[PDB]
Each structure stands twice: as structure tokens, then as C-alpha cells.
Paper text:
The ALDH3A1 crystal was soaked in its mother liquor containing 10 mM octanal. This resulted in a homodimeric structure at 1.80 angström resolution, where each active site of ALDH3A1 is occupied by one octanal molecule. Interpretation of the electron density maps in the active site region near the catalytic Cys 24350 led to the conclusion that octanal is present as two alternative conformations. Considering the carbon atoms’ positions, these two conformations are very close, with hydrophobic interactions stabilizing the aliphatic moiety of octanal by the surrounding residues’ side chains (Tyr 65, Tyr 115, Asn 118, Leu 119, Ile 394). This elongated hydrophobic pocket seems well suited for the binding of long-chain aliphatic as well as aromatic aldehydes such as those catalyzed by ALDH3A1, in accordance with our enzymatic analysis. The two conformations of octanal only differ in the positions of the oxygen atom of the aldehyde group. The first conformation of octanal, is hydrogen bonded with Glu 209 via a water molecule. In this case, the side chain of Cys 243 is oriented toward Asn 114 in close vicinity within the active site. The second conformation of octanal is such that its oxygen atom is hydrogen-bonded with Asn 114 via a water molecule. This residue (Asn 114) could be involved in the stabilization of the oxyanionic form of the hemithioacetal state during catalysis. Our structure likely corresponds to the step just before, obtained because of the absence of NAD cofactor needed to complete the catalytic turnover.
Residue numbers in the entry:
A (entry chain B): 1 to 448
B (entry chain A): 1 to 447
Write the structure that this text describes.
């Protein structure tokens, strides 16, 4: 089959040794830089068609991080790839002890649809830097990016080592029967279990970047104006379709009304009075997801927004107050511009609220009290944490990005990408000469 | 069920916060130190009964590494557990960026039978240090150590947080239905896939320490007296039942008889003429494994040994010459005292031989030519590597221990154990101060 032949060619090309010299890897990374530069208008147009993005947020909210990653890993690749001496002991002082890094082989990257360029190419950048063949499976939901990547990737990258696999769920299922040396999947918690089950048949290690509801705790005593501007920004970028969007708000009921008003103000500054007329506001990816998200407003106390246009998959920025935690909008990852507010009476209540639910990909708190910050971190668990901002903690080269529990396992970005897509092999190299001090280990054992 | 309630109690204990203070973890680690000191005779007796170890190799080949790990982790725990600052950028100078380590929760350790104390308790030591509840499943095949641990662990450790689950395959299958936050399993490649499949049901991350055939390449021009004494030691310790034993030898045909003679010489020095009478020689763990290993001798050319005693599960130290790579002894992990020699005609042929097989837990090479060593490492892949020795590379605090491909995923030992049993959580803390340098990120976007 076409899928099986693609993987066969990728493994043969890996086995030829072509990816091992750093020179080759840097060239492929420089080819991706060229792709981003030459295909700028094509990439913008695909994101516009898929997600109603424009040239500005296509670059600053997605593509730029791929370029940043490429530039960083190119500059650091020789240091990362070098054998790494480690601490010795008195008994090993004449030996070499070091960590040897080597590629895993053929890596599979399964992209998702909400950031269809970054979440396909930024993982690939890492796997390329580590010397692997990298098979790509774009998500079919962002049809235009999927079609574009299938066209332009082979025009820049090695054709056998870095193939693009077209199709939807049936094709991914057949792809997942092939033998890979690592699989990185971004998407839903449920499908993560399916990926891990398929990987188990080959003992394939997996990096699973999954889902959840990223809580956003707002401290009574903080600067509600700057806090609410940042929350609005992170909740409503990409029309709410972000893996680390602040999903919902936990706040004292005594500030629910001020939070609603300052969110409204910031939203009006961002997108104007009618977000439907703003070039900076996105659309829902599909008819199914539009229907799903609209369903989450039914029966709720709408403080703002609450309408949607099925024809264009527009859902107006929506805020819900006094939300029952047991209601639909609080029982699934929203992934839409509907922001519920859940009332808690204390920090300790919020911690308990967070801890009773599955571990989220991100946890956010807004507060100028360091005791509040340290305590919420110490008593909770999440993939990552941001205090007094949203989104940004997953854009930093020094902060590995990934989940825990139902939000996923493993991480990548920056140096962690190189490690995740490598085997780190412990090496002990001794001189081959008689060592009187070793003789104590040989039998016979001392009889007394 | 007993198993359900045990894990229930362990998660309740963990969720109360009892393991979070470092002083509590150190108290538990100190209790393990006291266990090892106070239960020395009992541990030796169980290892003698299960595996025909003695007082000396019970300690120096198994238990000492657990003590070393405990002392090391106690010393380093505050530093390892500290929030770890990471590199900032021009845009994040006013921010805090750091890695926060936190326990995963309830960790399961499934032990195996060949080092039944070390491969249950040394993983546990790391998971305790990282602040987790640790459920233990000893291997049923090492019956005496399994029963001993079920008795003494709750006599020394917190009884809710660190339960011992009794039983065999059915009980392990039952246990694997429970929801854990990490599973470390040491055992066979095939069962590792079963573990990972069970883990996937709860999105449980796994550390799988599995199997394969660790090759031992012997270079034509090296000091064979030194090399063969080291190879003999690693191959025949624990009666060959070691995950990183040098499984088979690859060598030029011209040194095959020299290798045989020098192996024989070292074996007689170690164990005497009749290894059955040596206090230092082990026994096979079970009747099934005894019959399995004897079967691998069938049809082979025996240069030394080749006999066994079924009733006491003794297999004489055995060397096989001119082995066909397609024969049974070269088609499964031997895990016994049978050492096949496969002839190859160059280093390149050896590398190709190794690469056409599944990635081994360990790869060994003996050579006084650094270029030979570097080339074989460069062109192969294995969990770890030792050049000019065997075994020892998995005993060093600074060398993470684990496989790749069919020999497993993940690693532990020393600091790596603490990382493996933690969630490393990226943290960004910014001032909630208005920033004019951030406002460029907000809509409306420029033209
Ligand atoms: C900074 C690299 C990742 C940013 C793109 C969106 C991430 C969503 O999962
Ligand atoms: C501290 C070295 C590892 C423990 C010894 C046995 C390893 C597995 O057979
Ligand atoms: K390095
Ligand atoms: K000795
Ligand atoms: K033969
Ligand atoms: K602006």
C-alpha cells in the first residue's frame, strides 16, 4: 500500500546513514527556513481558509515559533549532539564515562488542526535535528494546510526521509500499524489512549500532547484590569481553539461582575463592538465543532455574546456567570470562545476544585501575592504553570512543553526536542589492561 | 478486592499530602536502610533459597547497590527537589522561569525474579525519593524473596503508602486494571507490550526495562587473557541470569579457540573443576527455565560443560563453538550459563550482524583500538555500552540505566530515578504590572 511503501522508503533512507552527519540535518532545517520564506503567502492563505487567520497572527501566533525553533536548534546542534562526559568515581577515575546521543530511527509526528503549521512542523524540526527520518500525518480538519504541506514539504525536504501521509482516521489507523521508533501525537485525551495502544505493539515510545480544561484562578486582591486583559487575550485568540487557552475562570463571587465588565472592555478593544467584522477574530474549524460549542451555551446565564452564525462558523465571544460545575460547559474542554466563570470562596476551595478534576495541560493564576502563587503550585499538578499571564509559558525555549496524566506524557521544544527524539546511551569505556583492584569482584568469594 | 482496597488506601494516603515533606521521604529511606541492616540474614537466606546466592554475592552483586542508592538520594534530595531556574530571554528578564518537580502520585513497581531484591527495591527507592506512593509487585518466581518482602516492607515502611501485592500472573493482571501515575516494569520484551497496553487504558507513563541478546564483540588484536576473564565473570554470574549478561560472543574465527581456552581457564579459577560444588555458582530459577536453557544446548557443539542436574536446576558453565546464528541458542535471550561463539570476518560484519537484530539492552566490545570502539558505538544502537568490561556500566550513579526499542524505554538510577518518578513542570511567573512592551501582542493587529 501507499502508506506502507512510504514508511519502507523512509526506513531504508534512514538505514543508509544519510541523517547522521550534522551537516545533512542543518541543511534540512535550512530548507524548512526557505520553505517558510518562499511559501509565506501560501501558508497565510491556508490558515485564513482553515481558521480565518490573517497574515499577522499567522506569523506571530504560530509560524514565528517554528522559525525561532529552527534557528535555535541549528546553532546548538553540535553541542547537543556531542558525547557528554559525566561524573566519575574513585573506582572509575581512569575510565571514560559519557552519554552518547543517537537517533531513534523513523519518527511519526501526528499533527492537529488548530495550529496546523506549528503543531506539525515544530515537532518535526526537533526530530530532524536529532537525526531521524520523520513521517508526517497532518490533521484532515484543517484541509487547506494539510493539502499545502503535502505539496510543499517534498519540494524542500528529502523526499524519502520526510514523507507526508494524506487522509483521515482510516489512513491514520493504517499508518499506526507501521513500526516507528517514536510517535509524537497532539490532540485529544481519548485518542491519546488509542495512539499509545498502537505504539505498544512495537514498543514504540510516545510523546502525547493532549487535553483538559486549563483552570484560571483570579485572586480577589489583584489588578483585575491587567489580569482580565491577558485572560481575554489568551481565551479568545484562535477563536478559543488553543490547547492552553484559559478554559474557565475560578473567582470569588464578589468579583464576578468586575471580571465580566473588564473582559467585555478588553474584548471590545480587541475586536470592536461586533467581533464578526474584525480581521483578527477566528472561526470554528468545522460544522461539528461549531454545533458542539454552541451546545455549551444552552441553558447558561449569558453575560455577553452567546450568538453564532452556523453558515460562517462564527461564535461571538461569550461569557457565562454562576456556572454549575456539573453543567456541559464545565464537563468538556471548551475549545471555543465561551468563557465560563465558576465561583469559589477561597484559594483552598479552588485548589480542591482543580485537584478533583483531571490534571490540566496548563494552570494559570492571577495574583500579586507570592504566598498564593507558591501554594497553588505546590498543592496542584499541571503540565505547565503561568502566573499573571497566559499562553506564553509554552513559547520559551527553556521551558519544556507537555502535560501530565490526562493532559499527556513527555515534552518537547528546544533542547527537550533533541532529547525526546534521541536515545541517550550510557557509555563506559575502560582501558584493556590488568587491573589488580578489580580482582576482588571475581570468585572465589572470601570464605570468611 | 484486596488489590483494589490496597491501591485505594495508597492513593488516599498520597492525596493527604503525607509524602510531600522531604523529611518524611528521608524517614522512609532511612527505614529501608534499617531494613537492610536488620534483615541481612533473612535477605541472604531468601536469595540463597531462590537463586543459590551466598552471603557475599547477595551483598556485593545486589544489595550493596540499593544501599548506595539510598545514601546518595538522601544526600542529594534537597538539591534535586529544589525549583530549578532556567535560562531567560531579553523579553523575560523581569520574569521567573523555572522547573518545578512534583510527584506523579501512586507509582507501581513490578519486580522481576533474577535480582529480586535490587529490581524491586532500587526502583522503589527512587520513587520514594520523588514523593510518590509506591505499590510493589514482586515476581512470584523468586518465591522466598516475594514472601519475605511481603512480611518486612510493612514492618519498616508506612503501611498505606507502600503496599506489597502478593500473587502471580492473575494478580498482576488484576493489579494492572488499577489506575497508577507511573509504572516501572522489569522483565521480558513480550510482557512489556502487555504492560504498556494496560497503561494506555489510563494514560499511565511507563518505564520498561526489557530484554534482548546483548552482544559481546571481541577484537582480534586485544589482550584475550584480560578480556576473557571479564567476559566469563559477567556471563556466568547469577548462573547467567542477568539482563546485561554478555549473551553471545562475536569474534574473528582466528581467535575462537584462544577465547575458549581462556574462558575455561577463568571458569576453573572462579568455580573449580566441578562448578556444582562452588559456593559462588548459582542455580536456574525454575524447572521451566532449566528445561528451556538445556534445550538451547541441544544440537550444539559443546566446548565446555553442557550437562545439568534437573532436580536442583544446575547447568554447568557451557561454551558452544561455531554457532549457527539461525539456531535456537542464537534466536532468544539465553538468560543462562551457555555462551555461544559466532564467527564474523570483520568489524563491519559484526556491526551489520548487531544492527539486523533488535536493539539490545547492553552492547559490549573488547579492543585496545579506540577507533574500533568509537566506530562500533557510532554505527549501532543499544540501551547502554561498556567497552573492555561487562556489567559495570549499570552500577554507576551517573549513567542512566535503560533500553531502547525492544530492550525498553525510559531509564533510572541516581538522579534519573528522581526525574523519572517526578513531573517536571515548567513554570513562568511574571509581574502583574502593566507592560507597554507586551501590548503589541493584542489586537487590533497592525497593517
Ligand atoms: C511556541 C510553540 C507552540 C505555540 C503554538 C501553539 C501551541 C498549541 O498547542
Ligand atoms: C546498581 C546496578 C543495578 C542492579 C544490579 C542488577 C541489575 C539487573 O540485573
Ligand atoms: K552534549
Ligand atoms: K577474587
Ligand atoms: K555448531
Ligand atoms: K496593539
Amino acid at each position: 500500500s501507499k502508506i506502507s511503501e512510504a514508511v519502507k522508503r523512509a526506513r531504508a533512507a534512514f538505514s543508509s546513514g544519510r541523517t547522521r552527519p550534522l551537516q545533512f540535518r542543518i541543511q534540512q532545517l535550512e530548507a524548512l527556513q526557505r520553505l517558510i520564506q518562499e511559501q509565506e503567502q501560501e501558508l497565510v492563505g491556508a490558515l485564513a481558509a482553515d481558521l480565518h487567520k490573517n497574515e499577522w497572527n499567522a506569523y506571530y501566533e504560530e509560524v514565528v515559533y517554528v522559525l525561532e525553533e529552527i534557528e535555535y536548534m541549528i546553532q546548538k546542534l553540535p553541542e547537543w549532539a556531542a558525547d557528554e562526559p559525566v561524573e566519575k568515581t574513585p573506582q572509575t577515575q581512569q575510565d571514560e564515562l559519557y552519554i552518547h546521543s543517537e537517533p531513534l530511527g523513523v519518527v511519526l509526528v501526528i499533527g492537529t488542526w488548530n495550529y496546523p503549521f506549528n503543531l506539525t512542523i515544530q515537532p518535526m524540526v526537533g526530530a530532524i535535528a536529532a537525526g531521524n527520518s520523520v513521517v508526517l500525518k497532518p490533521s484532515e480538519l484543517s484541509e487547506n494546510m494539510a493539502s499545502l504541506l503535502a505539496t510543499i514539504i517534498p519540494q524542500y525536504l528529502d523526499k524519502d526521509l520526510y514523507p507526508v501521509i494524506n487522509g483521515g482516521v482510516p489512513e491514520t489507523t493504517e499508518l499506526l500499524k507501521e513500526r516507528f521508533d517514536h510517535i509524537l501525537y497532539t490532540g485529544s485525551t481519548g485518542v491519546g489512549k488509542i495512539i499509545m495502544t498502537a505504539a505498544a505493539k512495537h514498543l514504540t515510545p510516545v510523546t502525547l500532547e493532549l487535553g483538559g480544561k486549563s483552570p484560571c484562578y483570579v485572586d480577589k486582591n489583584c489588578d483585575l484590569d491587567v489580569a482580565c486583559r491577558r485572560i481575554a487575550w489568551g481565551k479568545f485568540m484562535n477563536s478559543g481553539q488553543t490547547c492552553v487557552a484559559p478554559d474557565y475562570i475560578l473567582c470569588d463571587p464578589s468579583i464576578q461582575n468586575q471580571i465580566v465588565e473588564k473582559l467585555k472592555k478588553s474584548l471590545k478593544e480587541f475586536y470592536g463592538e461586533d467581533a464578526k467584522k474584525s480581521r483578527d477574530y477566528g472561526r470554528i474549524i468545522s460544522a461539528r465543532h461549531f454545533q458542539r460549542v454552541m451546545g455549551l451555551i444552552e441553558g447558561q446565564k449569558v453575560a455577553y455574546g452567546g450568538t453564532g452564525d452556523a453558515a460562517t462558523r462564527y461564535i461571538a465571544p461569550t461569557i457565562l456567570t454562576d456556572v454549575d460545575p456539573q453543567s456541559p460547559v464545565m464537563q468538556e474542554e471548551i475549545f471555543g470562545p465561551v468563557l465560563p466563570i465558576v465561583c469559589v470562596r477561597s484559594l483552598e476551595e479552588a485548589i480542591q476544585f482543580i485537584n478533583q478534576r483531571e490534571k490540566p495541560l496548563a494552570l494559570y493564576m492571577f495574583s500579586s501575592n507570592d504566598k498564593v502563587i507558591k501554594k497553588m503550585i505546590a498543592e496542584t499538578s499541571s503540565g505547565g504553570v503561568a502566573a499573571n499571564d497566559v499562553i506564553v509559558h509554552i513559547t520559551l525555549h527553556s521551558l519544556p512543553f507537555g502535560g501530565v496524566g490526562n493532559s499527556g506524557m513527555g515534552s518537547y521544544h528546544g533542547k527537550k526536542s533533541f532529547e525526546t527524539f534521541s536515545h541517550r546511551r550510557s557509555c563506559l569505556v575502560r582501558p584493556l589492561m590488568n587491573d589488580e583492584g578489580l580482582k576482588v569482584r571475581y570468585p572465589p568469594s572470601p570464605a570468611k
